[PDB]
Design a protein around this ligand. Structure first.
Ligand SMILES: [Ca+2]
Ligand SMILES: [Ca+2]
Ligand SMILES: [Ca+2]
Ligand SMILES: [Cl-]
Ligand SMILES: [Cl-]
Ligand SMILES: [Cl-]
Lengths: 11, 11
């Protein structure tokens, strides 16, 4: 995952 | 997104 927001959301 | 499977999941 990317974004530091977990799966999906921000890449 | 990527993967044709919805937000997140498969890239
Ligand atoms: Ca994310
Ligand atoms: Ca997405
Ligand atoms: Ca996906
Ligand atoms: Cl992500
Ligand atoms: Cl993502
Ligand atoms: Cl996709």
């Amino acid at each position: 995952d990317x974004x530091x927001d977990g799966d999906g959301x921000v890449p």
